[PDB]
Paper text:
Methionine aminopeptidase (MetAP) removes the N-terminal methionine residue from nascent proteins in all types of cells. MetAP is therefore a potential target for developing novel broad spectrum antibacterial drugs. E. coli MetAP is a typical bacterial MetAP, containing only a catalytic domain. A surface-exposed loop containing Y62, H63, G64 and Y65 (the YHGY loop) is an integral part of the active site pocket.
We report here five new X-ray crystal structures of the Mn(II)-form of E. coli MetAP, each complexed with a different inhibitor. All eight structures, including the five new ones, have the typical "pita-bread" fold found in other MetAP structures, and each of them contains two Mn(II) ions at the dinuclear metal site. A single molecule of inhibitor sits in the shallow active site pocket. Common features of the Mn(II)-form selective inhibitors 4–8 bound to E. coli MetAP in the five new structures are that all use their carboxylate group to coordinate with the two Mn(II) ions at the dinuclear metal site and all take a non-coplanar or twisted conformation for the two aromatic rings, consistent with our previously reported structures of E. coli MetAP complexed with 1–3. The twisted conformation found in all of the Mn(II)-form-selective inhibitors 1–8 is in agreement with the requirement of a hydrophobic ortho-substitution, such as chlorine, on the phenyl ring for inhibitory activity. The twist angles observed in the MetAP complexes of 1–8 range from the smallest 23.3° for 6 to the largest 52.9° for 4, suggesting that in general, the phenylfuran-based inhibitors dock into the active site in a conformation that may correspond to a minimum-energy solution conformation. The residues forming the dinuclear metal site (H171, D108, E204, E235 and D97), as well as the nearby residues S110, T202, F177, H178 and H79, show little change in position upon binding of any of these inhibitors. In contrast, residues Y62, H63, G64, and Y65 in the YHGY loop, as well as residue W221, moved significantly. The same is true for other inhibitors, and the loop show a great adaptability. This flexibility allows the binding pocket to adapt to different shapes of the bound inhibitors.
Numbering used by the authors: 2 to 263
Write the structure that this text describes.
């Protein structure tokens, strides 16, 4: 059941969200040509455990083997860190982190462009982040999630891209995935009116090509059916009385932590 977080819980969410965002800030320098997704994962976990004194929520979730998800180019999500997978020039990579601190979760991801960026890669990532931003700018009490989902899709599709249907944002707090589901496209099933105190994520997965995906035989790795590029950005937020506050904001984000509509 969708719950309203207390001022105390919200503060714990701010701490967890900050830590998650800081893992992404910390790993940035390591995302260079020649590094393996495997070592990047080890680097993230060492930081989370030893420095943040927190724990990755992904490690073991539904059986996930690693601490963070790392997806490259045509891989849509759930890419498994591998010691034999090296980043290369032109690659676009998503690193998705979720940490648990004092009982609460912080969930966020971002795209990193490796080496010399490609105009196409750079555009898919920019548009994807912008679809997330426009959605965040719509968040406030009274609005229906169906509206936000419809807006993301409309913006993305106008760019000639597509929105992955199999995955969605979600409520979050003491649990990794709580209600409600946050669809990134228009669905006749969606009907959720936002209220202050609600905490959830927005994390659109955008394909340069067709929306259809395929799961690899390792039971986790998801790729675009047509093998086109795919990007995703994610933030955890809390609905306020007149808008929202992004709990996982990073220094490289080009959107304010607090979004006011007064
Ligand atoms: O951002 C998320 O909500 C997210 C990322 C990855 C997962 C997830 C979901 C189901 C099973 C395993 C994972 N995971 O992170 O290992 O959820
Ligand atoms: Mn995530
Ligand atoms: Mn999430
Ligand atoms: Na990708």
């Amino acid at each position: 059941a969708i719950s309203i977080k207390t001022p105390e819980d919200i503060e714990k969410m701010r701490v967890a969200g900050r830590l998650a965002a800081e893992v992404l800030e910390m790993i940035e320098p390591y995302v260079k040509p020649g590094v393996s997704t495997g070592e990047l994962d080890r680097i993230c976990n060492d930081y989370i455990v030893n420095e943040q004194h927190a724990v990755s929520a992904c490690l073991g979730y539904h059986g996930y083997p690693k601490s963070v998800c790392i997806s490259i180019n045509e891989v849509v999500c759930h890419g498994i860190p591998d010691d034999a997978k090296l980043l290369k020039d032109g690659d676009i990579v998503n690193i998705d982190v979720t940490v648990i601190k004092d009982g609460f979760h912080g969930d966020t991801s971002k795209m990193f462009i490796v080496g010399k960026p490609t105009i196409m890669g750079e555009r898919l990532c920019r548009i994807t982040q912008e679809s997330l931003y426009l959605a965040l700018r719509m968040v406030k009490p009274g609005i229906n999630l169906r509206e936000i989902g419809a807006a993301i899709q409309k913006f993305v599709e106008a760019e000639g891209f597509s929105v992955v249907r199999e995955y969605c944002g979600h409520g979050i707090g003491r649990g990794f995935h709580e209600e409600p589901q946050v669809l990134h496209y228009d669905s006749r099933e969606t009907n959720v009116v936002l209220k202050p105190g609600m905490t959830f994520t927005i994390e659109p997965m955008v394909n340069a090509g067709k929306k259809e995906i395929r799961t690899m035989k390792d039971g986790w790795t998801v790729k675009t059916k047509d093998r086109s590029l795919s990007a995703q950005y994610e933030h955890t937020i809390v609905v306020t009385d007149n808008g929202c506050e992004i709990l996982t904001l990073r220094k490289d984000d080009t959107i304010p932590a607090i979004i006011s509509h007064d």
